[PDB]
Design a protein around this ligand. Sequence first.
Ligand SMILES: CCCCCCCCCCCCCCCCCCCC(=O)O[C@H](COC(=O)CCCCCCCCCCCCCC)COP(=O)(O)OCCN
Ligand SMILES: CCCCCCCCCCCC(=O)SCCNC(=O)CCNC(=O)[C@H](O)C(C)(C)COP(=O)(O)O
Ligand code: SF4
Ligand code: SF4
Ligand code: SF4
Lengths: 157, 83, 311, 165, 54, 65, 385, 112, 185
Amino acid sequence: SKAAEFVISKVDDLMNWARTGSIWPMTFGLACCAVEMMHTGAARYDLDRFGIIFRPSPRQSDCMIVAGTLTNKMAPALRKVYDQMPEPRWVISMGSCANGGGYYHYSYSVVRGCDRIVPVDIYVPGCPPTAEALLYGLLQLQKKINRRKDFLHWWNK
Amino acid sequence: FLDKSEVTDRVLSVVKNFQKVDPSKVTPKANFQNDLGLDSLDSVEVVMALEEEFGFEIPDNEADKIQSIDLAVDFIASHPQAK
Amino acid sequence: YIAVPAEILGIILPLLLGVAFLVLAERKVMAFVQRRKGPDVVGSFGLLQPLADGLKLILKEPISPSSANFFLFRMAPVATFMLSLVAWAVVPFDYGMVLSDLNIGLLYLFAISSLGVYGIIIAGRSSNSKYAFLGALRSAAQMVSYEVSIGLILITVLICVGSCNLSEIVMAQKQIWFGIPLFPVLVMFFISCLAETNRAPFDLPYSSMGFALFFLGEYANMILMSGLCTLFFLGGWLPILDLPIFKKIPGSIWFSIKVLFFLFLYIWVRAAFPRYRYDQLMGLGWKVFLPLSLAWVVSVSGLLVTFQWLP
Amino acid sequence: KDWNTVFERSINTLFLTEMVRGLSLTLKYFFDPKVTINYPFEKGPLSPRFRGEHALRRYPTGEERCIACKLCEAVCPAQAITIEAEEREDGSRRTTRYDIDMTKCIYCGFCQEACPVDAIVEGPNFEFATETHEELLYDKEKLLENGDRWETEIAENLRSESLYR
Amino acid sequence: PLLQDGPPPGGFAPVRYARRISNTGPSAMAMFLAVSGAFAWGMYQVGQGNKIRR
Amino acid sequence: NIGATLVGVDKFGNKYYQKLGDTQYGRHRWVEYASKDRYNASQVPAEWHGWLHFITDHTGDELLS
Amino acid sequence: NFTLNFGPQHPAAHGVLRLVLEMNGEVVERAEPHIGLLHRGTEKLIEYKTYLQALPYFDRLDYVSMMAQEHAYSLAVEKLLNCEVPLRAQYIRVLFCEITRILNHLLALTTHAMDVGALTPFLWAFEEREKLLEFYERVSGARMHASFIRPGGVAQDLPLGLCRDIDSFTQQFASRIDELEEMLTGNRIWKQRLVDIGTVTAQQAKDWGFSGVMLRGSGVCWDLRRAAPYDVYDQLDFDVPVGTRGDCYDRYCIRIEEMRQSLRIIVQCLNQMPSGMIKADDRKLCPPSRCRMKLSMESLIHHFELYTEGFSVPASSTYTAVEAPKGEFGVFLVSNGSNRPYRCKIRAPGFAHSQGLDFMSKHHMLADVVTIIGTQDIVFGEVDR
Amino acid sequence: IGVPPNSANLTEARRRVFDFFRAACRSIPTIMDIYNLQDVVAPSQLRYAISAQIRNNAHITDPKVIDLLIFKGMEELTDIVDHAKQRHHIIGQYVVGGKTDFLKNFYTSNYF
Amino acid sequence: MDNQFIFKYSWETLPKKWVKKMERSEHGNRFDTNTDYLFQLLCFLKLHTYTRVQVLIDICGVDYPSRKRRFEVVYNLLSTRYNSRIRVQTSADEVTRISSVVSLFPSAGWWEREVWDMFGVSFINHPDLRRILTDYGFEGHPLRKDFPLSGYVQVRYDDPEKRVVSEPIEMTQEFRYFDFASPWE
Ligand SMILES: CCCCCCCCCCCCCCCCCCCC(=O)O[C@H](COC(=O)CCCCCCCCCCCCCC)COP(=O)(O)OCCN
Ligand SMILES: CCCCCCCCCCCC(=O)SCCNC(=O)CCNC(=O)[C@H](O)C(C)(C)COP(=O)(O)O
Ligand code: SF4
Ligand code: SF4
Ligand code: SF4
């Protein structure tokens, strides 16, 4: 523990720094929150500037933004896409529809929250959430990632 | 053409799988819906089982004509595809 | 003689660093073109972003898609990496700064470029996805169809030099650069290199290190083709044609500057134009560039022979 | 047509003269000021009518303005509000439970414009993303804390639209 | 109140809404002559350089 | 933060700057956070939140009174 | 021939698109779109809401054109109520409908160009999109889903500087359109990827129920703002662009011209907008002022009744259609005399356009199906309610 | 192809019932291959399942109701033929399957 | 061209046995016909020179549980040449098949599929009458008045079963119905 408390801490800090500095989300555009995601990545707010670049396939993405109304017919595809991403993965719920059904909560063909299909790490409220609200949500996800201690816990077991 | 022995065995064997058909009454001449007291659903189910034990097909106009196992076994013995 | 691995390391590792920073430069230049800024939070000006990307793709705990022979699938990125890096052993950066001074360098480059078709093909078949297989087949056909025109343009350049030595092709441009007379040839060569690399309007298209190696090989190919464009037409390491007072600048800087200019042209062209279709890629490459390259070969050879201006 | 026209349009076909005109535009936009904003440091412009996080206001004497009229609960198109009320010890009509589902809320402002006492308002706050689902089930205490924390800005905004509402 | 949002007295300025032409070019005639002259002079210089190299 | 005017200081130590714009704007109302430990992304009080987002022209020192 | 599946989950092409393509070689022989992934039961939820409570549902139908659906719903309610709208409110509604048309046209054009492969015009257009969403965020409190247009008049009045800022915007939007047009119109790749792709005859457009740019690209001069004018559209001067060949290139040119004409209409609305009140004076159908509800007994009673029960529409049924940016957006509203609609069908232009994808794409390359899909400007919020 | 016109008597309804049953029977081998039902179910248990459904809906005497039932069954069969439904769904529906009922219900809950 | 002219012209020209109810108003000129004369009426109204109706805007159903013929099918029509709109309505219950108009208007296929999905009305000679909007394997027709707003089944992920499953619905907060009707209406 003369250097483990130090070397393990520094290597874990390096891991967290890499993961926070390079996040590659998979935008799961479903409804009018997709317009807000496109506005976030445009020139005004520049989601790229923080290192976030969107990806088309789940093979190469470590984050997944569910933004839109999740219907009963679409939930199996949602789960299938989620199951295809590599292990250090996070899910961000954007808008009221993805959070708890939103304005179609009492519908017969709407999943009342994407958290019933996939585990959600960050909930971004709004209808639609402001692009800066999505920036705040991604920053909160980054803050949560910095709390991870993967190498220390691996050492402690 | 096919010999009568094997076709008679194949029509006498599968008919005992309806959980109500009496094994003592099945014979080369035993009508499905009349002599055995079957239902029209069973009347088409026997024909379906005829094409369930082989790959050939019976057209819809060849199923409701004669519900007799004697003509059925004659037709089976006159099936070149089977063996 | 144990210092040859030192030279190979010194030419390979900076190549990989330059490829990573070329990806960063592309993502920054496109942002500047579209009235925004590229990655800036990570570094002082985003210079640390590629390192973060590298550690991310390294630390992913990925799974191997062993639903195949697992040999050809695993070695196809390795093979394309082989071919992408092996072509840098002959490219000269200044007078005597070449690792291998072949006397058949132009033909060796042609062979290396023609042998780059196998990696994408093997990757396409090894992946059980039929659609990826068809896409790889289409990409291979495109690379082939434009490698033909690249070879013809190489003939056009070689006629005026008289030797396949790359370091002598540069010295042959001491009077004037070959890009001035053969400007249409230079434009055609740049467009063919755009189509050869599956890039620009000509760019129709698994995880972890296989895709990493494919990506690195493609960008190393981009750098190599920019180097070839400045090596055959822009005079290589030779200084500016006029005003010979800045001669204190080393010749290796001029080669770098011209390569950066051509890389800026790659990024510019891809940012400024939409994509072509496959039925138009083949038609264009077989009906606009092959006849033009052949005609330019004929014209240059006939003009040089007529006035006895041959090497 | 004219030989001159044929020559002119054949040159433009071969010299790519309609692509140089696009390259020039992209390059001219390369050397230009950027319009991206440093989000953590500088925020985008907003309006005093902005509909963000909900807040329950109170009178300057310290008494909550909500009178348990349930007029906001009946107008809510998303049914995101649940109110329970009873007679307080003083005999005043006040709420015991006032909770809003932020996962059902559509942020339409109908509740704000239906309140006859200006008790429920949507403040300027839009950065309240949570890490847990039931942290988005705001209750009376959370809404009152929001109202106390954003009281000055909410008051200034309500003063601004006094001329419009 | 009596002070309501609207156009200022006299109205707003007139604004263009049609496409503006852009005749920015080196011309069809000039480019061909420039490229052909560059080719001829450059081939002459290439011949001179080949003579010096020989 | 160069060629800029410091509008005011916050209770948390945050400094607010302003620059004059002419026709296109840009970098005219921002904050220099007094902290550097990830800055929590939300540390602007209610009196300064309106000024930062251009909701109100009052600085926030004037909003207190 | 084999069976192919395009489900793009990423919103690089719609996001919930599901095409089952039967391809012989590289050609496609039939395109069967599987819809229903965004069917949220909007039509049934309307029947359980008050007429006021059902207004925000129309914001989320065609979420690129928000004001267009609210305008149609409000016009249907006014038709069933015989409610007169003040002139200033009509001018505001027309102004914001044309702003919405410009926004929709910009997003459609540049999202279509990005699918082809032109990345640059996308961000250039979203800059102006942000500028116009600022104007939405000023009058209402929401950047996108602004419940501004309401059955009586309009929700609330304009801030002070809105007209000046919109004029400043219109001073440069022409040059913005000019640059976007210069990027794409003259380019030979853009011509080659759209010319003769997706040709539709006028008879086919009429038979398949096409409307808007889809119909007008075939030579049919049918604009609902000139055939069945509403609000103050008959007092404004604007041209109706008409195509000649019906391909995807004519659609793009008409989409440019329509946005220029919308700029023209916006300028006219700014110049001619009068003064007055913004809602119907019948307070039995519109909310009272916040100062009047706190001072008058009858105003407070009206406020209470409106914000609990709402107004009751007399028993009738009608179909009202407006010229939405996509095409003809219609609402079939049935009332039984109560405070809640008995039935409200939403006729989405994207439904009839995505239905016709089968015949437009037949015997076309696979890479042309994305252009055929993008030229129709389809969003699935309206395709499946 | 097109939806058949509405029947006029019970004999036509019976003929359509038999035609639909035969179509479902011919559809049995395809399901055994699209879904891994080879080492799951005998090729006759499913046949008995469709027979049992037809028999327990066999008290209908209205030809229009019979035609609607046939149409719904054909729609279900077409859906099952395609990969639209999940694998366990058909296995969840198409499988053949002590004091007093009242006292157990009483022990369970008050709402019977 | 106008409601006053179309009404009289169709009163005179149309066969009398087809239409059984004609409303002429500003909300819309409607025609009510028997389900066995719908196709004939629309074919006449699609080909006649003075009534060239060539655009079928949409087909919608209306549910009236208190009527013997429960469902009302509405055909909104548009004539581009004469700038007029015509609405034609029929009535059908749950177990009668009405004639399809895909032969006349090719666009009618998707609205007919939507009507069948939402109300359960079947169309004769429809090339493919299958549900278009509801989830695969959906049971019941949601747009009926007797169908509950939230439906009968709910969808959630089952970890042991490793798939998304369907379960009977169980709301954490039921839909609160507010009765605002007034006795002085
Ligand atoms: C210092 C550095 C300077 C810059 C160096 C780099 C130069 C390139 C810079 C970027 C230039 C634009 C790159 C765009 C990339 C995609 C462009 C491809 C378009 C293309 O291929 O055009 C084709 C025809 O034009 C063509 O054929 C194009 C090739 C023409 C080559 C020029 C031949 C001219 C010969 C004149 C000789 C006269 C002098 C000698 C006497 C198709 O066009 P299409 O659709 O019409 O199909 C023809 C059917 N018929
Ligand atoms: C995997 C396969 C997917 C699809 C499987 C099928 C799913 C749906 C199953 C069909 C559900 C139905 O109710 S569709 C069939 C419903 N139709 C009837 O029941 C007609 C009334 N029955 C009679 O007339 C007689 O009893 C008769 C039985 C005909 C014979 O007896 P006789 O001739 O002596 O008279
Ligand atoms: S939360 Fe609101 S904006 Fe987002 S998808 Fe749902 S309804 Fe649309
Ligand atoms: S903003 Fe709208 S949805 Fe949200 S609580 Fe208020 S009335 Fe309900
Ligand atoms: S917040 Fe306002 S509207 Fe809602 S119950 Fe309280 S006083 Fe009534």
